[PDB]
């Protein structure tokens, strides 16, 4: 043989009245479609084979042709939106959902895989898969006392497909669907397989990527301690989605943010804020910026965990996108912090790295930094210490950056700049 058939040969066999012949041609098509160098997906579609493949899904007496067409349709569905649409238009969604019940584990797994590709196209196909009733049979495949008695590759594929049912926005998944899936997802979040664990974190990060009501659905399931545990893992494919989920959560209410602090997340941040992977430092700092946007007692938690020197470090040397988050973290800190907390920030050395970033061409970061300066001067005014801080910004060259920015293109930048000049500078 079934290796390297022409498409016209495949058509001839599928159009024969002979189920065995059809099986040989379907396998041939599967082998064409499973080659890494540009599989002929459009050719297979243009030959009108998808309806015949979908009808083979229902041939319970010929499980080999069920598997071969399932695999063939899987790889078509893995293509572009137009190619996934052709699989959907051929009626494949109900047929795959029926296959979830097959007594042949490799066939139900293939159905699981295919639905994951269809659902992975976007919210519309995701919700169509849900409306056809995929969730109940998928979850029933995972209704065992001990997950570790399932085949590793089977369990990984189910986790990945479930994570696609949690993915995408505009709109987010149906509330009923999320709430039906969550308990199984919480169980997978405690499984020992690193790939199951990564995809479960990814699913949780999707569900926490939204309004506070969505964050609350997840947090109410008690998964935040497990997220913090996974946050400390050595495997970066696990840390990345774990940090994403934590960062999502601390964009919600102050009470939801507090659960992350209570679970111990801040103790991991010395390593996260120096992590050699650029994306980890960026999203660790982004997470910090939304904690320092919180309550003064939560800012005080950041101080107590020794994280202000780590913010000074990121602000001093990091990828610029990480430095921008660090600028945000500081402006949030200085917006809500106490005078004593703001003084502590200055004593840790925030001024000079904050000045140096006034050379960046990013207009938003200059605004963010200039706003932090006002907040910090405001604290010095409640102490008569403005003069001593004015000198600090001068003594490290900050006022060259400020007394120049008064002639900037942006109006809000020019206004804050000459204001800082006239009031102190």
């Amino acid at each position: 043989g079934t290796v390297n058939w022409s498409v016209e040969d495949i058509v001839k066999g599928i159009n024969s009245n002979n189920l065995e012949s059809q099986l040989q041609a379907t396998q041939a098509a599967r082998k064409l479609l499973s080659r890494e160098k540009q599989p002929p997906i459009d050719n297979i579609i243009r030959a009108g084979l998808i309806p015949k493949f979908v009808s083979f899904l229902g041939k319970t007496d010929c499980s080999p042709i069920q598997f071969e067409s399932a695999w063939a349709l899987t790889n078509i569905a893995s293509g572009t939106s137009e190619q996934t649409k052709a699989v959907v238009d051929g009626g494949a969604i109900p047929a795959f959902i029926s296959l979830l019940a097959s007594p042949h584990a490799h066939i139900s797994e293939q159905a699981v895989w295919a639905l994951g590709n269809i659902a992975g196209d976007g919210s519309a196909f995701r919700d169509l898969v849900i409306k056809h009733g995929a969730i109940d049979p998928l979850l029933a495949l995972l209704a065992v006392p001990d997950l570790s008695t399932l085949a590793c590759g089977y369990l990984r594929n189910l986790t990945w497909t479930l994570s696609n049912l949690c993915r995408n926005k505009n709109p987010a998944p149906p509330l009923d669907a999320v709430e039906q899936i969550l308990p199984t997802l919480v169980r997978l979040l405690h499984h020992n397989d690193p790939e199951v664990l990564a995809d479960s974190c990814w699913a949780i990060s999707y569900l926490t990527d939204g309004p506070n009501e969505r964050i609350e659905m997840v947090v109410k399931k008690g998964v935040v301690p497990q997220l913090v545990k996974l946050l400390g893992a050595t495997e970066l494919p696990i840390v990345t989605p774990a940090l994403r989920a934590i960062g999502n959560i601390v964009t919600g209410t102050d009470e939801q943010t507090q659960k992350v602090i209570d679970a111990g997340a801040l103790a991991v941040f010395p390593s996260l804020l120096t992590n050699p992977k650029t994306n980890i430092q960026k999203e660790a700092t982004w997470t910090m910026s939304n904690i320092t946007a919180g309550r003064q007692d939560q800012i005080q938690q950041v101080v107590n965990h020794g994280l202000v020197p780590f913010l000074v470090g990121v602000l001093s040397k990091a990828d610029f996108k990480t430095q921008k988050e660090a600028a945000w973290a500081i402006t949030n800190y200085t917006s809500g912090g106490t005078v004593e907390q703001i003084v502590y920030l200055v004593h840790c050395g925030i001024i000079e790295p904050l000045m140096n970033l006034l050379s960046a061409k990013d207009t938003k970061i200059i605004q963010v930094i200039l706003d932090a300066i006002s907040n910090i001067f405001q604290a010095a005014e409640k102490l008569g210490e403005t003069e001593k801080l004015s000198i600090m910004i001068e003594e490290c060259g900050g006022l060259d950056k400020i007394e120049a920015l008064q002639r900037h293109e942006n109006e809000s930048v020019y206004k804050a700049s000459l204001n800082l000049i006239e009031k102190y500078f």
């Binding site: 499973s34 890494e36 790889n75 893995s78 293939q110 895989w113 994951g116 590709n117 992975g120 196209d121």
Partner: peptide, 8 residues
């Protein structure tokens, strides 16, 4: 992570 993936 991958939205879609073929079987190889």
């Amino acid at each position: 992570p991958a939205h879609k993936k073929p079987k190889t």
